[PDB]
């Protein structure tokens, strides 16, 4: 039997999940993907700037 | 020549009249081909 | 190698040893007053903390040079980012956290559902099994589905205005008939996704268990790998369909 | 236990058609994209509304079977 | 429980063919768009008038299902 | 309830052939339009003729079902 | 009520096939017309006779269905 | 009354296939005539015998339905 | 009366396949004729071989149904 | 009379697949031959192989029907 | 044992369409990449999306069959 | 008697898919052969792979019928 | 003995779909390979993925049938 | 019961056949990836 209280409890579990995983990984990992993209972009602009 | 005439008879819609068959609007760059003799003595032909 | 296919080990306790089926749709572990925590809830918690530890290891001393765990995590994240950009490039970062966490948690839950001990380890009195896949619980799949439905509805109200005349009501033309069907399909979408994921994990668990019942040895080797592929594809497509529904709602 | 057979027939016969429908949809979509790579942004829209309608058709039978259950 | 199996058969057999009809319609529409995106404005309207008629039989099946 | 299952079977089976026929009609007409927008009304007339034939068959099924029920 | 389900099955099965046949006929005819509008009447004559032959089976099934009902 | 459902089943299942076959025949023949107008003389002469062969099965179904009736 | 239902089922189900098969054969043969008429004498032979195989299956079903009848 | 119904089911259901398979085989082979006559020998050999496979699968049901009857 | 037939039908019916849909999607995707090799990386995603839609319908049938069992 | 009906269904049903898949395989293989004769060994090997995959299900159904027998 | 017919129906209706699915998979794969044998592994990979998925559905039907068996 | 050891050795052989099929391919998706990554980073190492 499906219990609405347990359903909302699954929502709270996934809220804890999403928020803690996001704050501990994804913003560091968005910084990582931005790091690679922004650094390649720095390389490109410095390439035409040096020539 | 007649093969191309037959083909472009079927391809009449503007959407499919693309690639080399498109009649471009707002012409900006034009290329001209010139064929000339490799040697002189041709008279006024090269000058013309 | 040659022709050494003998399958001698396979002919070992075909059906005398293992139980016939011993499966259940939902089970409860409880253990505390108030909220009856389930074993699927326990697997959700352990996968949560496991991915947290894997994340902290990935984010432990971040370097300009990827390597090891950092490299593969960046691989997955950037591949997903490019895949979502291939559909829509304007609302990626908005839905990227929800989409990525849904994909990763579903993938890891499906993969953990295939580990040994999921149907074997259970507390007593009848034997209620422990270590149940989170997707095997409807309470979790419906939770993800309703979360995605709320997210898509909120973003489709935020963008394109609150009009929805294409699906709410139309004055003339067949669009009036089209709009109602669009609304019905939109309402169907979360239930469809929830049932899809729940069934595609629970049926896999049932199949691997009942194949462990009959000729337990060496036969389910390809089916286990197939079930890994099934779980990975389900995790990927849940995220992909979430983002696609978001984009089409934006349109 | 005739209700069990009723639900079984509902679910079984409400999916054989929609499955072929979805297959035809996305196969035609893939073929069109391969033929015309340029046009992809909006054709996927029609593909997905077709998919949604077919899935709604299947879930109608699924929900009817669940009601009978 | 002949009413239950009746409703089951009605819904299932009303979803059998119209689903394939929806699929063939959308496949043809996508093929036409791929061959000619510029005819989109009219071809999508033709697809919609077709898809409404195709869904009409499914709607009839659902109505009969609810009546039973 | 044999009357009920008879009515349901009539409606359900009568909706299959006409549905697939309408689908094939619309697909063929749409593909022809894509290959030839200049014959639009002329082919739309035949598309509607075929759709009318299929709808007439479906209406025969539906009215038989109504008479049974 | 076995006569009722007999009538229902007859009508449904007699509608299943001819609908698909008529649909394929109209799709092929419209495809040919789009390819070749110049012989529209010529191909459309064959289209009508094929549609009549396809509808013949539907009429047979409906006739037997009326006889039972 | 099992004879009634028997004959209904016979006439019904005698139509779902031959209709599709005749439709495929007519669609292919019309497409071929569109590709080649002048070979209609040799296309139609084979189309008619193909339609007759396909409809022979439906006629067997109908005569068996009459015998059962 | 189970013999009657047996004859009905045999005649029906032994005709739905061969009918579609004959239709596909004739469509393919007519398409090949449209591609090339001079290969008529060579393709018609195998067309008739396929038609004979399908009709042999159908006649086997019909004869078994007659034996039951 | 249930064994008679079993025989009818075996005969009728054992030809639905092989008939369509033989038809598709012959259609593809004839279309290929029209496309390329010079590959006729190899195409006919593979056509015979496929038709033999389908015929054997039909005989699988035919022998069972004979045994029951 | 009506529950046995119910769970047999719930899985048997409902998986027919998924198989044909998977096949259609696979054929369409393979043909598209054969014509357009470079878009394979982008279109395999939609191929798998359609395959998983079909497998989802099959899985609905499977879980309903298991519940009935 | 059920046992006989189950044997007929197991032999009959479950061979339609392995009656049409083999035919589609062979038609595609001969079409590829006509389109490419120099790739005969590769296409024939993959054709035999497909034939073996289909005959696997065919033999599964046949042996299940024998067990039911 | 209803378990016997339940098993037969499960096997048959779970095998008819996958046969057509794998048939279309192999036909599309061989057609694409014949069109361009240059790209082979990146097509056979998805061919085998589709074959594995379809055979997995077939084995789902097989195991659920064996549960009753 | 038999299910314990059955799952244990079936999953261990699953990991072992995964190893057989994807040891040098797991290397293909990890080692060759980090080779691609250092190939990428060398360029803007030079550019400074």
Q: Which residues contact N23 (CB under 8 A, 6 or more apart)?
A: none
What kind of experiment solved this structure? Answer: cryo-EM
**L15 has a chain J CB within 8 A of its CB:** yes
Residue written as tokens 């896949």?
C133
Residue C86 and residue C78: Cα distance in Å, rounded? 12
SS3 call for H14: coil
Chain F residues whose C-beta sits inside 8 Å of any chain B C-beta: 37-38
Cα-only R_g, chain G: 16
Contact call for residues G25 and G51 (beta carbons, < 8 A): yes
Nearest to A17 by CA among C43, C145, C129: C43
CA distance D56 to chain C (A): 5
Contacts of D9 in chain K (CB under 8 A): 9, 13
The token pair that represents I55 in the structure block: 């009709």
Q: Which residue of chain E is at minimal alpha-carbon distance from F5?
A: E6
- Which chains have 3+ CB pairs within 8 A of H? G, I
J33 vs chain L: nearest CA distance in angstroms? 7
Mark which residues 151-180 of C lie under 8 Å from E by CB: 174-175, 177-178
Measure Cα distances from C222 to C7, C126, M52, M53, M56 in Å. Answer: 15, 32, 10, 12, 10
Judged by a CB distance cut-off of 8 A, whether residue L62 touches chain M is no
Chain K 24-53, residues with CB within 8 Å of chain D CB atoms:
24-25, 27-29, 31-33, 35-36, 39, 43, 46-47, 49-50, 53
Alpha helices (H) along D2-42: 2-13, 16-35
Whole-angstrom Cα distance, residue C100 to residue C97? 5
Which residues are CB-contacts of I38 (< 8 A; sequence separation ≥ 6)? Answer: none
- What is the rounded distance in angstroms from the CA atom of residue K30 to the CA atom of residue M1? 45
The whole-angstrom separation of Cα I31 and Cα I26 is 8
CA distance C114 to C108: 10
Pick left, alpha or beta for residue C51 (phi over 0 → left; psi -120 to 50 → alpha; otherwise beta).
Answer: alpha
Helix axes K40-68, D2-13, angle to 10 degrees: 170
M12 alpha-carbon distance from chain centroid: 13
Sign of CA dihedral C217, C221, C223, C227: positive
M24-58 burial code (b ≥16 CB/10 A, e <16): bbbbbbbbbbbbebeeeeebbebbebbbebbbbbb
CA atoms of C44 and F59, how far apart (whole Å): 53
Rounded to a whole number, what is the distance in Å from the CA of G15 to chain E's nearest CA? 11
Please tell me the distance from the alpha carbon of residue D24 to that of residue A43, in angstroms, as a whole number. 46
* Residue ranges in chain H assigned as alpha helix (H): 2-13, 16-35, 40-68
Interchain proximity J5–I7, CB inside 8 Å: no
Q: Resolution of the coordinates in A?
A: 3.0
Residue C123's H or E segment, with its range, is strand C122-123
Neighbours of chain E (3+ CB pairs under 8 A): B, C, D, F, G
Chains in contact with chain B (at least 3 beta-carbon pairs closer than 8 A): E, F
Between chain F and chain G, how many beta carbons pairs sit less than 8 Å apart? 151
| Distance between CA atoms of residues M12 and M65, nearest Å | 10
> In whole angstroms, how far apart are CA I64 and each of C241, F32, G10, M15?
52, 46, 22, 26
The answer to whether N3 and N11 have CB atoms below 8 angstroms apart is no
- The answer to whether D1 and K2 have CB atoms below 8 angstroms apart is yes
Structure tokens, F44 = 């739309």
Which residue in L6, L12, L39 is closest to M37 by CB distance? Answer: L39
Whether chain L has a CB inside 8 Å of the CB on J66: the answer is no
SS3 C122: strand
Rg, C-alpha atoms of chain F: 16
* Residue among M17, M19, M28 minimizing CB distance to K27: M28
- Residue C45 tokens, joined: 């918690």
Per the CB < 8 A criterion, the answer to whether L51 and J53 are in contact is: yes
* Residues in chain C within 8 Å Cβ distance of M66: 214
Cβ of D19 within 8 Å of Cβ of K17? The answer is: yes
User: Are residues H47 and H25 in contact, defined by beta-carbon separation less than 8 angstroms?
Assistant: yes
Neighbouring CB atoms inside 10 A of K27's CB total 29
Residue C113: DSSP 8-state = H
Q: Is the dihedral of CA M65, M66, M68, N4 positive or negative?
A: negative
The C-alpha angle L27, L32, L38, rounded to 5 degrees, equals 140
Nearest chain A alpha carbon to N43: A43
Q: How far apart are CA E2 and CA F1, in angstroms?
A: 5
**Rounded CA separation L28/L22 (Å):** 10
| Separation CA C102–CA B9 (nearest Å) | 55
Breaks in chain F (C–N beyond 2.5 Å) sit after: none
Distance separating alpha carbons of residues C111 and C208, to the nearest angstrom: 13
When scoring G25, G34, G64 by the number of chain F Cβ atoms within 10 A, the one with the most, hence best to mutate, is G34
Both tokens of residue C150?
């709320």
C226/M60 touch (CB, cutoff 8 Å), yes or no: no
* Token pair of D48 as six digits: 């997905």
Query: After which residues do gaps appear in chain E, with C to N over 2.5 Å?
Result: none
């Amino acid at each position: 039997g499906i219990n609405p209280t347990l359903f909302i409890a699954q929502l709270i579990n996934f809220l804890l999940l999403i928020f803690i995983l996001r704050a501990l990984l994804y913003r560091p990992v968005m910084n990582l993907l931005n790091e690679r993209t922004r650094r390649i972009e720095e390389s490109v602009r410095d390439a035409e700037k040096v020539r | 020549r007649e093969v191309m005439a037959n083909l472009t008879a079927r391809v009449v819609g503007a959407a499919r009249r693309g690639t080399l068959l498109e009649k471009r609007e707002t012409v900006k760059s034009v290329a001209l081909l010139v064929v000339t003799p490799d040697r002189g003595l041709c008279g006024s032909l090269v000058a013309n | 190698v040659g022709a050494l296919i003998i399958s001698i080990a396979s002919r070992f306790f075909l059906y005398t040893g293992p139980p016939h089926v011993e499966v259940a749709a939902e089970v409860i572990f409880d253990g505390i007053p108030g909220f009856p925590i389930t074993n699927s809830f326990v697997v959700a918690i352990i996968i949560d903390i496991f991915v947290i530890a894997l994340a902290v290891a990935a984010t432990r001393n971040l370097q300009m040079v990827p390597r090891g765990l950092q490299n593969v995590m960046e691989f997955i994240l950037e591949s997903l980012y490019n895949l979502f950009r291939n559909i829509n490039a304007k609302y990626v970062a908005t839905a990227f956290p929800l989409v990525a966490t849904i994909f990763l948690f579903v993938l890891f839950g499906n993969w953990f559902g295939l580990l040994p001990g999921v149907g074997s380890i259970g507390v007593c009195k009848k034997l209620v099994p422990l270590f149940r896949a989170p997707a095997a619980d409807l309470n979790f799949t419906f939770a993800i589905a309703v979360i995605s439905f709320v997210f898509i509805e909120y973003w489709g109200f935020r963008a394109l205005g609150p009009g929805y005349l294409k699906k709410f009501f139309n004055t003339n033309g067949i669009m009036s008939f089209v709009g109602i069907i669009e609304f019905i399909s939109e309402l169907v979408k979360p239930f469809a996704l929830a049932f899809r994921l729940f069934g595609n994990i629970f049926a896999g668990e049932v199949l691997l268990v009942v194949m462990a019942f009959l000729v337990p040895l060496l036969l389910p080797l390809p089916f286990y790998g197939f079930e890994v592929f099934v779980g990975f594809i389900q995790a990927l497509i849940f995220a992909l369909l979430t983002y696609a529904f978001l984009n089409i709602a934006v349109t | 236990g005739l209700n069990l057979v009723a639900t079984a027939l509902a679910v079984g016969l409400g999916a054989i058609g929609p499955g072929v429908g979805i297959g035809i949809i996305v196969s035609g979509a893939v073929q069109a994209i391969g033929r015309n790579p340029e046009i992809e942004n909006r054709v996927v829209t029609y593909m997905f509304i077709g998919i949604a309608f077919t899935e709604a058709l299947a879930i109608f039978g699924l929900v009817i079977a669940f009601l009978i259950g």
